[PDB]
Amino acid sequence: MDDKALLVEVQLLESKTYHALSNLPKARAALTSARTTANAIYCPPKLQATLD
Amino acid sequence: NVEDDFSNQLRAELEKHGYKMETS
């Protein structure tokens, strides 16, 4: 039942690792969860830039 | 009948290392 801005950041960094291997599916699934909490700003500038 | 390739396995690995120098 939990998402948080900090929890998204782990998933943003996991997507990055997946992009470098050349695999979009596992990354795309992960992107979704991350953008949703992001929509309403609740974060310092560093998290925002990673999500972007 | 039985394939000559098996007997060839041991002989083929070794050949490779020498051959490249020996012949062009």
Binding site: R28, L31, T32, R35, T36, A38, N39, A40, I41, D52 | -
Partner: protein, 279 residues
Amino acid sequence: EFLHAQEEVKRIQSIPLVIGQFLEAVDQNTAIVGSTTGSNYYVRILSTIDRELLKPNASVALHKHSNALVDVLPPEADSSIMMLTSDQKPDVMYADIGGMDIQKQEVREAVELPLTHFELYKQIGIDPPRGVLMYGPPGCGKTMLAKAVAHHTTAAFIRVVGSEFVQKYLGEGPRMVRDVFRLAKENAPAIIFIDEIDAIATKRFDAQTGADREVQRILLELLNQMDGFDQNVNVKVIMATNRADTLDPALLRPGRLDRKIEFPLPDRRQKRLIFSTIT
């Protein structure tokens, strides 16, 4: 003689013809159908050609001279032009708009994939996706997303308003509710879209107001359609509303519509995408 005889039937199979709808089979020989001429008919099904893919529900043609069922029509034929999205089509796609990329992927996953592919959902073993409820801010192009996926499928789209569900001859209105859903099944893959349920999904109704009676039935029938649809490959109703307080909180709830999607009212990134099209 057989080649000469077949010629004779072909002529009959062809025009003149009068259209009907073929309900159901009571015999392989003869079957029951209903016309647009205002007559229900018992008509004979032509032999030495199939009468065993005749049997499912479809549009059908009956000969004018002989009063028989010589041949069949697609289920596509004899659609209304009263109805939306059968003298229009959307031309939009995902590329054409910027923002709400997160939202676009969710809608796409739910609507677009089962239509195109029935098999993927089966392998995994889940029931194919249910409809998506779209509620959010005005003008964020919530409906636009529904247009972009509808276009991608390359299939029939039946698009109706709330006003089209309610009567046209007084009391026609509940009957029309049954018709729209079944019509989509005959010409499936297909999408059913409701632009407005602004006075239909509202809990409050009277019968002391004669007008309210048809409307309170349209809501009750819509709850039902969701029940019958389940544990099959039929996708649910996809709808658009202004707010989230018009719909009922205890008659419609998630896991009868898989995804119930709110579109962000604050969203910094969405706006960045709108400006970037200009760039």
